[PDB]
Amino acid sequence: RQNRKCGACAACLRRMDCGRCDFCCDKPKFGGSNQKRQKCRWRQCLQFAMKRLLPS
DNA sequence: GCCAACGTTGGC
DNA sequence: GCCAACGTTGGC
Ligand SMILES: [Zn+2]
Ligand SMILES: [Zn+2]
Structure with a gap:
């Protein structure tokens, strides 16, 4: 695998879906x-997610 | 065995 | 070059 949590950005710090x-929704x-x-x-x-997965 | 979500690719 | 789609896999 490739690590996908940097662990210290606002996305990784977020608690719930x-x-x-x-x-x-999917x-x-x-x-x-x-x-x-x-x-x-x-x-x-x-930092680590493929860019196409970020908010748009 | 399940399952969240990673990682690959057919079809564009 | 791009990604929607889904097969796969690590963690449980
Ligand atoms: Zn992060
Ligand atoms: Zn959401």
Whole structure:
């Protein structure tokens, strides 16, 4: 694997899923269909996440 | 065995 | 070159 948490940015410090972004809504637990399978947009690490996963 | 989400690629 | 889509995998 590649480490995807720097651990010290506002995204990594965030506690809970936002429950409103495209990735959250897609989670089965939020009622989505699991077609995207990514972590909350607002929990995507600002240093280590692929840039396409950051908020837009 | 489940499952969050990583990591690869077919199709553009 | 890009990413939507989903197969995979580490942690539990
Ligand atoms: Zn979210
Ligand atoms: Zn971070």
